[PDB]
Every structure is written in structure tokens, then in C-alpha cells.
């Protein structure tokens, strides 16, 4: 019926088959959370008018060498406010003037594994 | 005047933990809304992200739609919000509007006793 498993004595032979699954699920949910934070217009969500980022169309139509830094601070504060699972955080915005776009490069670490640097890279328009 | 209660480990208090828990709950509810209102397959970096809530789903609404949507939402939440412990999704159809009442009761991993909830209306595009 069943071949019995000798688990009466089992110290260092302990296995955890959920480590990589729960860690990689955590990372996936964090990246999707980041995308939702960045792509939601701040003030558009009535249950939380503070949620999201301020990325108006004038910010893309009138691009200056300060746009990158202001968008960097905006995104950084939004992520600190709405994704507490991120430990180390660094946002770099590249203004692509010829097509009026912004490259958002987010390098971060997860609270559980603050050593590994994960990264996402998006391109925003209007 | 001496308030040395923090000296004993049993009498140790941190009055900022409830604040951090509140901020975490707000971020969880916002993540939930993101998951519920994103069409599954529409996100290129993760085609598994979101829910199956289509114009066909809202237009061809039957008394089985509720259970279908409850299961779909439960699966999306289990797959994309691991901070949620206990989870119950109750969907009530509004046929004359082609809309859905979605109630989500859940607990947070850090303290699984307290039951939180959101309640939202969903419609087609």
C-alpha cells in the first residue's frame, strides 16, 4: 500500500522544496507591483489618491535635463511608500528626446535577500 | 519619572510597528486592486498577471459567472500577492448593469487574526 518513509530520525537530511518557488514568486509579485505603481497615474485611484506616479503628458512634451532627476525622485518616493518589500533602491531615468520617451531603470533588492540586485527596465510615453 | 519598561524582554514595546503594518496593509490593498483590474495576458512582461475579466464575461452573465470569477480572482491573488493569508472572494452579479460586486475578505501574513476587506464594482470597457 505505502512504502514507509524513515522520518523518525532526520536532522541534516531535511529538504525544503519550496525555497526557490516562494522566492521566485515573491520576486515576480514585487516586479508586477512595481509596474502597477509606476504606470498608475497619481490621483486617479479614488480609494487612494496618493497611489501612483505623477507622469503628466507635459512632462514628456517638455523634456529637460531636470526631468530625469524629478521623475527619479517621484518614482523612488512612490516605491518607498507602496512597496515595502524592496530594500536597496536606485532609479535612473534616461530622457530619449528624439522620440519623447523615458527609459526607467529600477535596480533594487528584496528584504528577504538584500544581497542580490534585481532590475527592471521600462519605457514610458504618453 | 523613570519609564524603564523596555528593559524586560516581555515588556518590550515598539509603537511604530502598528504604523508599518498600516502602511503594509495600504500597499496590499493597492496591489490587490492592480491584480483585479488588469486583464490577464495584457501585461507583456508577465502574461500570467491579471484576471480573466473580459467584455464577453460581463456581457454573457449567468448565475455561474459568480463562482467562475471567484475562483479566477482567488487564483490570481494566491499567485501574485503572497502577503495575503486567509482569503475569501464573494462575487454578486448585477445583471441589469452587466456589472460585478466583488468582495474580498483576507488576512495579512504578519498577523493572521485580523480580517480586512475591500469591496468594488467591476464593469466591461
From Swiss-Prot, chain A:
Induction of the gene: Expressed in the late phase of the viral replicative cycle.
Predominant location: virion
Domain of life: Viruses
InterPro entries for the chain: IraD/Gp25-like
Cellular component aspect of the GO annotation: virus tail, baseplate
Subcellular location: Virion
Function: Baseplate protein that is located next to the tail tube (inner baseplate). Involved in sheath assembly. The gp25-(gp6)2-gp7 module is involved in sheath contraction.
Assembly mode: Homodimer. Interacts with gp53 and with the (gp6)2-gp7 heterotrimeric molecule; The gp25-(gp6)2-gp7 module is involved in sheath contraction. Part of the baseplate macromolecular complex which consists of gp5, gp5.4, gp27 (central spike complex); gp6, gp25, gp53 (inner baseplate); gp7, gp8 (intermediate baseplate); gp9, gp10, gp11, gp12 (peripheral); gp48 and gp54 (proximal region of the tail tube).
Protein name: Baseplate wedge protein gp25
Organism of origin: Enterobacteria phage T4
